[PDB]
Amino acid sequence: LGAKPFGEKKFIEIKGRRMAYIDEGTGDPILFQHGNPTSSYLWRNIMPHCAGLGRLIACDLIGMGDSDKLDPSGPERYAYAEHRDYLDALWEALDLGDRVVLVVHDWGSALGFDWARRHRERVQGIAYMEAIAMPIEWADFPEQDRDLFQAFRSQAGEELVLQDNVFVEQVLPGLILRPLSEAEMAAYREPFLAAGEARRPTLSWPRQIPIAGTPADVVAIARDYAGWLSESPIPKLFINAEPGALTTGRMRDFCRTWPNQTEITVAGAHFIQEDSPDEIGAAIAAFVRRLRPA
Ligand SMILES: [Ca+2]
Ligand SMILES: [Ca+2]
Ligand SMILES: [Ca+2]
Ligand SMILES: [Cl-]
């Protein structure tokens, strides 16, 4: 393992805000996208395995990691649509080319799957794990975290997240099988040290999960990429997890019907990158080497 970040953080202005990202190497990109409540830091022990396979990139979503916070912030800020506008602009600014390999997780998968559907001719391959592959019902949501997420999606959310930082301090460690070090937790809470709106992205995200028809716009978007991915011949690498969390039950059954897909299983709950980084990295590397023969 290791608590040290992969590369130095670079900054670029997007829509008036500064966004942070890692960009190492040259050639076609291998784009790693984190979800909630993480950052590019999530891929620190995985990206090394792809050394020499291309341009390794990991962006910090707006309001997360070292990226600027949006202000004024509130209940209407940091919705999926807003994150998409910033990420779309950042990915355009990075000049990725037309043979991109996406490596996604959680909300990074929702964003990545949607981007892929919209820019399909530029996607060489898609690696995903513990993703939001389709709209779901409450019965599809992990039983142990069901109550808590329903709470985030209620008036109690602000206190749980903005005041007590529950997503970072409780959910994150709770969904990692091995104990994190002081340094690792420090890196994860750094973007959310201040109570209040600074933590808004970690609350807006759970309120955006397409569950039981709400929110309607994200449900539609997920419905769209779910259908497309179930038909797309683009090469895929599905990293299943045991016991896993989000991508289990019906969603897992669905993902397993996707075309031209290779699958492996690694130990982990949700933030599996912290449990089996080497297995995950090795699998992604092999996937990319097959996609970029030489
Ligand atoms: Ca080329
Ligand atoms: Ca309940
Ligand atoms: Ca734990
Ligand atoms: Cl979430």
GROMACS .gro file of C-alpha atoms and ligand atoms in nm:
model
  298
    1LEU     CA    1   0.000   0.000   0.000
    2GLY     CA    2   0.115   0.355   0.073
    3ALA     CA    3  -0.017   0.695   0.177
    4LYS     CA    4   0.195   0.896  -0.068
    5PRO     CA    5   0.009   1.052  -0.365
    6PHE     CA    6   0.090   0.936  -0.719
    7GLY     CA    7   0.209   1.254  -0.886
    8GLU     CA    8   0.217   1.626  -0.820
    9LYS     CA    9  -0.111   1.813  -0.848
   10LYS     CA   10  -0.155   2.040  -1.150
   11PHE     CA   11  -0.410   2.322  -1.177
   12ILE     CA   12  -0.609   2.469  -1.464
   13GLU     CA   13  -0.884   2.730  -1.472
   14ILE     CA   14  -1.224   2.602  -1.582
   15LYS     CA   15  -1.535   2.819  -1.602
   16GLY     CA   16  -1.369   3.067  -1.368
   17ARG     CA   17  -1.276   2.802  -1.112
   18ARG     CA   18  -0.945   2.627  -1.058
   19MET     CA   19  -0.955   2.248  -1.086
   20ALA     CA   20  -0.681   2.009  -0.974
   21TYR     CA   21  -0.561   1.694  -1.145
   22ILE     CA   22  -0.272   1.452  -1.189
   23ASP     CA   23  -0.126   1.410  -1.540
   24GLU     CA   24   0.185   1.195  -1.580
   25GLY     CA   25   0.349   1.047  -1.888
   26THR     CA   26   0.263   1.078  -2.255
   27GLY     CA   27   0.056   0.902  -2.519
   28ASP     CA   28  -0.309   0.799  -2.512
   29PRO     CA   29  -0.475   0.863  -2.177
   30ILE     CA   30  -0.580   0.622  -1.906
   31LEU     CA   31  -0.831   0.841  -1.724
   32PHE     CA   32  -0.908   0.754  -1.360
   33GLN     CA   33  -1.217   0.914  -1.209
   34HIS     CA   34  -1.304   0.903  -0.838
   35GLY     CA   35  -1.645   0.937  -0.675
   36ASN     CA   36  -1.785   1.043  -0.337
   37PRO     CA   37  -1.627   1.146  -0.099
   38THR     CA   38  -1.283   1.081  -0.249
   39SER     CA   39  -1.044   1.244  -0.496
   40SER     CA   40  -0.759   1.154  -0.732
   41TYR     CA   41  -0.591   1.025  -0.414
   42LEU     CA   42  -0.808   0.714  -0.439
   43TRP     CA   43  -0.599   0.589  -0.732
   44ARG     CA   44  -0.251   0.654  -0.587
   45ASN     CA   45  -0.159   0.285  -0.551
   46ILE     CA   46  -0.330   0.177  -0.872
   47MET     CA   47  -0.196   0.425  -1.127
   48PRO     CA   48   0.165   0.306  -1.077
   49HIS     CA   49   0.078  -0.032  -1.233
   50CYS     CA   50   0.003   0.146  -1.560
   51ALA     CA   51   0.346   0.309  -1.584
   52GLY     CA   52   0.461   0.320  -1.945
   53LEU     CA   53   0.118   0.231  -2.084
   54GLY     CA   54   0.018   0.588  -2.160
   55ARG     CA   55  -0.073   0.926  -2.015
   56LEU     CA   56  -0.199   0.866  -1.660
   57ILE     CA   57  -0.464   1.117  -1.554
   58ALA     CA   58  -0.673   1.157  -1.238
   59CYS     CA   59  -0.896   1.464  -1.195
   60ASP     CA   60  -1.041   1.605  -0.872
   61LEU     CA   61  -1.412   1.676  -0.924
   62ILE     CA   62  -1.521   2.034  -0.861
   63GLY     CA   63  -1.545   2.110  -0.489
   64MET     CA   64  -1.343   1.799  -0.410
   65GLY     CA   65  -0.976   1.714  -0.362
   66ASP     CA   66  -0.767   2.020  -0.444
   67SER     CA   67  -1.026   2.165  -0.683
   68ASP     CA   68  -1.196   2.496  -0.601
   69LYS     CA   69  -1.518   2.509  -0.403
   70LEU     CA   70  -1.819   2.663  -0.573
   71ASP     CA   71  -1.956   2.978  -0.411
   72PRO     CA   72  -2.210   3.067  -0.306
   73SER     CA   73  -2.283   2.705  -0.212
   74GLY     CA   74  -2.614   2.558  -0.102
   75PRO     CA   75  -2.870   2.274  -0.140
   76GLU     CA   76  -2.896   2.339  -0.515
   77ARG     CA   77  -2.520   2.327  -0.574
   78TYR     CA   78  -2.303   2.031  -0.681
   79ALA     CA   79  -2.579   1.835  -0.855
   80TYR     CA   80  -2.472   1.579  -1.118
   81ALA     CA   81  -2.545   1.821  -1.403
   82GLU     CA   82  -2.316   2.084  -1.253
   83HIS     CA   83  -2.033   1.835  -1.198
   84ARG     CA   84  -2.074   1.723  -1.559
   85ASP     CA   85  -2.036   2.077  -1.689
   86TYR     CA   86  -1.705   2.123  -1.508
   87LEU     CA   87  -1.567   1.775  -1.578
   88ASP     CA   88  -1.666   1.798  -1.946
   89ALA     CA   89  -1.481   2.130  -1.973
   90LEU     CA   90  -1.174   1.999  -1.790
   91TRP     CA   91  -1.152   1.683  -2.003
   92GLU     CA   92  -1.181   1.900  -2.314
   93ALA     CA   93  -0.904   2.130  -2.189
   94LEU     CA   94  -0.671   1.836  -2.125
   95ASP     CA   95  -0.668   1.742  -2.496
   96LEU     CA   96  -0.731   1.369  -2.446
   97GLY     CA   97  -0.746   1.265  -2.811
   98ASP     CA   98  -0.965   0.986  -2.949
   99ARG     CA   99  -0.832   0.664  -2.788
  100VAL     CA  100  -0.917   0.715  -2.421
  101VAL     CA  101  -0.930   0.437  -2.163
  102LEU     CA  102  -1.162   0.520  -1.873
  103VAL     CA  103  -1.117   0.374  -1.523
  104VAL     CA  104  -1.416   0.467  -1.308
  105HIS     CA  105  -1.576   0.422  -0.967
  106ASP     CA  106  -1.892   0.539  -0.788
  107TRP     CA  107  -1.997   0.883  -0.913
  108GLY     CA  108  -1.690   0.881  -1.132
  109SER     CA  109  -1.857   0.595  -1.321
  110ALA     CA  110  -2.187   0.779  -1.365
  111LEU     CA  111  -1.993   1.076  -1.505
  112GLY     CA  112  -1.757   0.855  -1.706
  113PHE     CA  113  -2.032   0.633  -1.849
  114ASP     CA  114  -2.230   0.939  -1.958
  115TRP     CA  115  -1.924   1.102  -2.112
  116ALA     CA  116  -1.844   0.776  -2.293
  117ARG     CA  117  -2.193   0.751  -2.441
  118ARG     CA  118  -2.167   1.110  -2.564
  119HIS     CA  119  -1.811   1.069  -2.699
  120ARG     CA  120  -1.820   0.697  -2.785
  121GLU     CA  121  -1.590   0.727  -3.087
  122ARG     CA  122  -1.311   0.843  -2.854
  123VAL     CA  123  -1.340   0.559  -2.603
  124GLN     CA  124  -1.093   0.275  -2.646
  125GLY     CA  125  -1.194   0.087  -2.333
  126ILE     CA  126  -1.382   0.112  -2.004
  127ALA     CA  127  -1.274  -0.030  -1.669
  128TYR     CA  128  -1.527   0.002  -1.387
  129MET     CA  129  -1.588  -0.111  -1.029
  130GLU     CA  130  -1.851  -0.042  -0.762
  131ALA     CA  131  -2.030   0.182  -1.009
  132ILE     CA  132  -2.372   0.335  -1.063
  133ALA     CA  133  -2.447   0.126  -1.371
  134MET     CA  134  -2.823   0.183  -1.379
  135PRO     CA  135  -3.118   0.336  -1.192
  136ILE     CA  136  -3.201   0.127  -0.885
  137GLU     CA  137  -3.468   0.068  -0.622
  138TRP     CA  138  -3.420   0.085  -0.245
  139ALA     CA  139  -3.422  -0.296  -0.234
  140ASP     CA  140  -3.108  -0.284  -0.451
  141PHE     CA  141  -2.922  -0.058  -0.208
  142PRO     CA  142  -2.691  -0.225   0.049
  143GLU     CA  143  -2.906  -0.314   0.350
  144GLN     CA  144  -2.660  -0.194   0.616
  145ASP     CA  145  -2.635   0.156   0.468
  146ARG     CA  146  -2.996   0.188   0.352
  147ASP     CA  147  -3.121   0.387   0.654
  148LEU     CA  148  -2.824   0.625   0.651
  149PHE     CA  149  -2.860   0.714   0.284
  150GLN     CA  150  -3.232   0.766   0.319
  151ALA     CA  151  -3.135   1.007   0.599
  152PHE     CA  152  -2.890   1.192   0.373
  153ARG     CA  153  -3.184   1.225   0.135
  154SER     CA  154  -3.389   1.398   0.405
  155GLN     CA  155  -3.374   1.718   0.611
  156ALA     CA  156  -3.136   1.540   0.848
  157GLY     CA  157  -2.868   1.536   0.578
  158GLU     CA  158  -2.724   1.880   0.650
  159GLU     CA  159  -2.650   1.796   1.014
  160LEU     CA  160  -2.511   1.452   0.930
  161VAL     CA  161  -2.282   1.578   0.654
  162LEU     CA  162  -2.222   1.953   0.668
  163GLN     CA  163  -2.195   1.958   1.047
  164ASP     CA  164  -2.060   1.613   1.134
  165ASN     CA  165  -1.887   1.510   0.808
  166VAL     CA  166  -2.043   1.161   0.825
  167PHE     CA  167  -1.967   1.064   0.466
  168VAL     CA  168  -1.593   1.123   0.513
  169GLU     CA  169  -1.552   1.008   0.874
  170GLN     CA  170  -1.806   0.724   0.889
  171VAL     CA  171  -1.907   0.593   0.546
  172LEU     CA  172  -1.558   0.600   0.392
  173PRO     CA  173  -1.379   0.391   0.660
  174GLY     CA  174  -1.690   0.180   0.709
  175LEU     CA  175  -1.671   0.060   0.349
  176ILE     CA  176  -1.300  -0.028   0.351
  177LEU     CA  177  -1.204  -0.368   0.494
  178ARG     CA  178  -0.851  -0.283   0.608
  179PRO     CA  179  -0.760  -0.014   0.864
  180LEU     CA  180  -0.650   0.319   0.716
  181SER     CA  181  -0.351   0.507   0.853
  182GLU     CA  182  -0.356   0.855   1.005
  183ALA     CA  183  -0.193   0.992   0.688
  184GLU     CA  184  -0.451   0.837   0.456
  185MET     CA  185  -0.748   0.970   0.653
  186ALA     CA  186  -0.580   1.311   0.670
  187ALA     CA  187  -0.560   1.318   0.291
  188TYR     CA  188  -0.928   1.226   0.259
  189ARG     CA  189  -1.061   1.479   0.509
  190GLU     CA  190  -0.834   1.764   0.398
  191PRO     CA  191  -1.086   1.901   0.142
  192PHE     CA  192  -1.355   1.893   0.411
  193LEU     CA  193  -1.182   2.017   0.727
  194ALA     CA  194  -1.425   2.307   0.762
  195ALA     CA  195  -1.783   2.240   0.871
  196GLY     CA  196  -2.048   2.389   0.646
  197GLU     CA  197  -2.070   2.431   0.270
  198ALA     CA  198  -1.716   2.302   0.214
  199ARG     CA  199  -1.866   1.955   0.271
  200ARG     CA  200  -2.168   2.018   0.046
  201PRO     CA  201  -2.039   1.798  -0.239
  202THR     CA  202  -2.045   1.495  -0.009
  203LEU     CA  203  -2.414   1.553   0.069
  204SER     CA  204  -2.535   1.660  -0.277
  205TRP     CA  205  -2.394   1.336  -0.420
  206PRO     CA  206  -2.605   1.090  -0.219
  207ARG     CA  207  -2.910   1.304  -0.297
  208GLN     CA  208  -2.836   1.253  -0.666
  209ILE     CA  209  -2.820   0.872  -0.671
  210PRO     CA  210  -3.091   0.748  -0.912
  211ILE     CA  211  -3.304   0.555  -0.663
  212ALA     CA  212  -3.678   0.486  -0.687
  213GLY     CA  213  -3.719   0.735  -0.971
  214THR     CA  214  -3.554   1.034  -0.801
  215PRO     CA  215  -3.397   1.255  -0.910
  216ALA     CA  216  -3.568   1.224  -1.249
  217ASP     CA  217  -3.289   1.384  -1.455
  218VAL     CA  218  -3.015   1.154  -1.324
  219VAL     CA  219  -3.246   0.853  -1.355
  220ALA     CA  220  -3.292   0.940  -1.722
  221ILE     CA  221  -2.920   0.988  -1.777
  222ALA     CA  222  -2.837   0.657  -1.607
  223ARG     CA  223  -3.117   0.484  -1.797
  224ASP     CA  224  -2.950   0.614  -2.113
  225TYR     CA  225  -2.594   0.497  -2.052
  226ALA     CA  226  -2.717   0.169  -1.902
  227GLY     CA  227  -2.897   0.085  -2.225
  228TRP     CA  228  -2.604   0.197  -2.439
  229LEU     CA  229  -2.342   0.007  -2.239
  230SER     CA  230  -2.555  -0.308  -2.257
  231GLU     CA  231  -2.522  -0.284  -2.637
  232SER     CA  232  -2.181  -0.123  -2.693
  233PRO     CA  233  -1.899  -0.344  -2.829
  234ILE     CA  234  -1.638  -0.123  -2.661
  235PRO     CA  235  -1.398  -0.344  -2.459
  236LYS     CA  236  -1.481  -0.352  -2.089
  237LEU     CA  237  -1.313  -0.465  -1.768
  238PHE     CA  238  -1.550  -0.527  -1.477
  239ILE     CA  239  -1.373  -0.546  -1.144
  240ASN     CA  240  -1.623  -0.720  -0.920
  241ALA     CA  241  -1.576  -0.712  -0.544
  242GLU     CA  242  -1.650  -0.955  -0.262
  243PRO     CA  243  -1.853  -0.886  -0.055
  244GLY     CA  244  -1.880  -0.567  -0.260
  245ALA     CA  245  -2.158  -0.318  -0.196
  246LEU     CA  246  -2.319  -0.109  -0.469
  247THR     CA  247  -2.247  -0.341  -0.761
  248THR     CA  248  -2.409  -0.656  -0.626
  249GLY     CA  249  -2.754  -0.811  -0.665
  250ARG     CA  250  -2.952  -0.687  -0.966
  251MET     CA  251  -2.698  -0.425  -1.075
  252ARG     CA  252  -2.425  -0.688  -1.086
  253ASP     CA  253  -2.652  -0.923  -1.281
  254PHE     CA  254  -2.709  -0.637  -1.525
  255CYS     CA  255  -2.340  -0.546  -1.563
  256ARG     CA  256  -2.264  -0.910  -1.636
  257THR     CA  257  -2.473  -0.892  -1.955
  258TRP     CA  258  -2.255  -0.615  -2.102
  259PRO     CA  259  -2.074  -0.710  -2.429
  260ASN     CA  260  -1.702  -0.768  -2.486
  261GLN     CA  261  -1.630  -0.769  -2.114
  262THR     CA  262  -1.364  -0.933  -1.896
  263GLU     CA  263  -1.431  -0.975  -1.524
  264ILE     CA  264  -1.220  -1.040  -1.214
  265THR     CA  265  -1.316  -1.044  -0.846
  266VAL     CA  266  -1.115  -0.874  -0.572
  267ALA     CA  267  -1.160  -0.839  -0.195
  268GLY     CA  268  -1.346  -0.527  -0.088
  269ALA     CA  269  -1.669  -0.349  -0.001
  270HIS     CA  270  -1.714  -0.014  -0.179
  271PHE     CA  271  -1.384   0.176  -0.180
  272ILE     CA  272  -1.206  -0.138  -0.302
  273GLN     CA  273  -0.906   0.063  -0.417
  274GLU     CA  274  -0.794   0.073  -0.053
  275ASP     CA  275  -0.826  -0.304  -0.014
  276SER     CA  276  -0.687  -0.457  -0.334
  277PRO     CA  277  -0.492  -0.186  -0.521
  278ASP     CA  278  -0.234  -0.427  -0.664
  279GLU     CA  279  -0.491  -0.673  -0.798
  280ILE     CA  280  -0.689  -0.383  -0.945
  281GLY     CA  281  -0.383  -0.214  -1.092
  282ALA     CA  282  -0.251  -0.536  -1.245
  283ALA     CA  283  -0.587  -0.610  -1.405
  284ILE     CA  284  -0.618  -0.261  -1.554
  285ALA     CA  285  -0.261  -0.279  -1.684
  286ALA     CA  286  -0.326  -0.613  -1.856
  287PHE     CA  287  -0.651  -0.476  -2.002
  288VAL     CA  288  -0.470  -0.172  -2.144
  289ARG     CA  289  -0.178  -0.378  -2.280
  290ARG     CA  290  -0.429  -0.590  -2.473
  291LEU     CA  291  -0.593  -0.271  -2.600
  292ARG     CA  292  -0.258  -0.116  -2.695
  293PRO     CA  293  -0.048  -0.405  -2.836
  294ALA     CA  294   0.319  -0.353  -2.921
  295CA      CA  295  -0.365   0.839  -3.201
  296CA      CA  296  -3.579   0.477   0.654
  297CA      CA  297  -1.325  -0.024   0.789
  298CL      CL  298  -2.302   0.921  -0.287
   0.00000   0.00000   0.00000
